[PDB]
Amino acid sequence: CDAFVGTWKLVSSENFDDYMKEVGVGFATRKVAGMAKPNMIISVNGDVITIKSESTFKNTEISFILGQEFDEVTADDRKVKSTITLDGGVLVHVQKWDGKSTTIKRKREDDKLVVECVMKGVTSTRVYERA
């Protein structure tokens, strides 16, 4: 995951409000979370990958080993079971909760780190660049 390591700043977002609606996020959280321009800090130590999100809304952090399920409390306060794997260079992150599922894909494209969030038929694309 060397090409993911570093500090990344959100530069564009598309359809994030609609994605959050599909996930079930309520109005007030959607408004405040949607304003945020987070930094994403990715680091690797051995087999442990750490992804931190720093924002005015809610600072989060996950550490994980690829293929090994873990507990995650998301920024919108869902308690989910998560598994992250590498599929052909793309970090694929599946979250399970309350019988539902959403998938977050993270990949390097040119000088960007592109995050694609999918809930049923609704996708949001969030693009980051190096700080």
Domain extent listing, the chain: 2-130
Q: How was this structure determined?
A: X-ray
Output b/e per residue, 48-70; b: 16+ Cβ within 10 A. ebebbbbbebbebebebeeeeee
Burial of 78 per CB tally in 10 Å (0-12, 13-18, 19+): middle
Distance from C-alpha of 71 to C-alpha of 19, rounded to nearest angstrom: 22
**How long is the chain?**
131
Distance CA 108, CA 87 (A): 13
Resolution (A): 1.3
Q: What is the distance between the alpha carbons of residues 26 and 29, in angstroms, rounded to a whole number?
A: 6
According to the annotation, is 78 in a ligand binding site?
no
Q: Is 121 helix (H, G, I), strand (E, B) or coil?
A: coil
**126 is annotated as contributing to ligand binding:** yes
Nearest to 7 by CA among 34, 38, 31: 38
The pair of structure tokens assigned to 104 is 């977050």
Single-letter amino acid, residue 116: E
Residues 102 and 48: their CA atoms lie apart, in Å, by 22
Name the superfamily (CATH) of residues 2-130: Calycin beta-barrel core domain (2.40.128.20)
On whether the CB atoms of residues 107 and 114 are closer than 8 A, the answer is yes
CB neighbours of 110 closer than 8 A, spacing ≥ 6? none
Answer yes or no: is 115 a known binding residue: no
Q: State how far Cα 55 lies from the chain centre.
A: 13
> Which pair of tokens denotes residue 111?
């000088």
User: Quick one: tokens of 129?
Assistant: 């660049």
